[PDB]
Amino acid sequence: QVRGLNKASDNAQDGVSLIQVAEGALSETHSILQRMNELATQAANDTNTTSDRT
């Protein structure tokens, strides 16, 4: 039990160590999507010509 619980703590700690990479990668998906919404709202205005929406 002690050896097995200590590897369960190692695997929960690996679980946390992995999870942070996924929720830390999705932080840049968010920081892109804030920029995509902000760009999409700029091109939504009809003062722009097609030269300025490309």
Add this chain to the structure above:
Amino acid sequence: QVRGLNKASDNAQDGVSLIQVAEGALSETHSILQRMNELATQAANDTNTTSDRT
């Protein structure tokens, strides 16, 4: 009886002495199995990739 009881004591000690060799070998069977259980607990976690379970 005295001569025979002294061989019976010598044979009961020759029995204890044999038993200790078996008992003290299974002490490393435990220590190998405590390691196989800890290794198996670690390899069970699906944060391990294939190379790291082989």
